[PDB]
């Protein structure tokens, strides 16, 4: 990520975007019932919990781009992965706008709650003002499309969420570049079929997990990654470390499929508006963007193949199975491979790869300690072939202590329970007890472990 130009919105003819300065998160009635350290992320330069300057650390993700071009290995990576995707027979033609908005098979309907982005956010216009899902009317949407066109700047929002104390004093708050609904629609009409195909085919052919249901997909992973092992690792600032060449490679893949190879460049050479500053970035991917999960996974698919070929000879790509969800990736090879060595091949590209789960060194992993989409793996008691997706109990305790909407505690709780029960009867029972220890939690409906277990078996 290299900031090319930065200037006042007034000197460019753009409005100043107003962003929430204070968190909506507040202590819930369970705050004292469960243990936790996390707290609301810093949303303003003036937060006593700070140590370093806000704007400083905030815009530190942009280290710039490392000098490097396309090599034969990347070309080979692109070639193999393309051939893999070619087996899915994806239709290159665009999709009707009616499908881009209300969805189709494999493509969820557009979220009508999130902001419409620029410039609607500055005109008081929301998505439900352009789309009438009630009568499926989108006439007003079409007008807006032709009125403001496309390739509009992205709005930078600070991510109001829970973070560890060290991220609080360090002012490390995550940003969420919000694309204009106009560009979300364009990207869906163009790539819609690809997005659809991927969502219906999470696995090793697409090398992607976007669209999967962890509850059933977890049982499949072990069968797909049928290798001599299983590897995972962490990325230090993945989004801001994606060098432009990966987009060039992504384009080639898309071109081998007969899709637009240039549109995606609007993500590489992106336009942004933080608050009163307008700027353009060269390199990196827009964090939290609308439809970038799939593109990020594809890039990772190209990266993994490259680093492997870079670190080893006599490698058989067909034997390297990959499953990615954006920057999160797990893969395997017929034979054992050194993760540390693979990691070092990333340095030349500007990718900082560290041990999985913020570990000390690059230690060997197994389905016993490996994680993916922040979930571990645990065999079911009754049926050993079914795999429980385990979510960190600590994270659940952390989440339940805060709430953004008090009158929605029932919904919040239910979500947690669906994650929780996968950790076991004893743990779930203790969770239920703590909740029901206060009148407010007693009035809540908590799904019994038997009911959750029963419903889970019927999903296979
Ligand atoms: C994926 N397996 C089929 C074999 C993995 C052997 S290992 O425990 O050494 O990673 C089953 C499995 C084993 C433990 C946990 C979750 C799944």
UniProtKB/Swiss-Prot annotation:
Mg(2+) 2 binds at residues 234, 327. Mg(2+) 1 binds at residues 234, 327. Binds 2 magnesium ions that constitute a dinuclear catalytic metal center. The magnesium ions are not prebound but only present for catalysis. Requires the presence of 3CDpro or 3CPro. It is a peripheral membrane protein. Residues 228-341 form the RdRp catalytic domain. It comes from Human rhinovirus 16 (HRV-16). Residues 1-460 are cytoplasmic. This is RNA-directed RNA polymerase. Interacts with Viral protein genome-linked and with protein 3CD. Its cofactor is Mg(2+). Replicates the viral genomic RNA on the surface of intracellular membranes. May form linear arrays of subunits that propagate along a strong head-to-tail interaction called interface-I. Covalently attaches UMP to a tyrosine of VPg, which is used to prime RNA synthesis. The positive stranded RNA genome is first replicated at virus induced membranous vesicles, creating a dsRNA genomic replication form. This dsRNA is then used as template to synthesize positive stranded RNA genomes. ss(+)RNA genomes are either translated, replicated or encapsidated. It is found in: Host cytoplasmic vesicle membrane. It catalyses: RNA(n) + a ribonucleoside 5'-triphosphate = RNA(n+1) + diphosphate. Replication or transcription is subject to high level of random mutations by the nucleotide analog ribavirin.
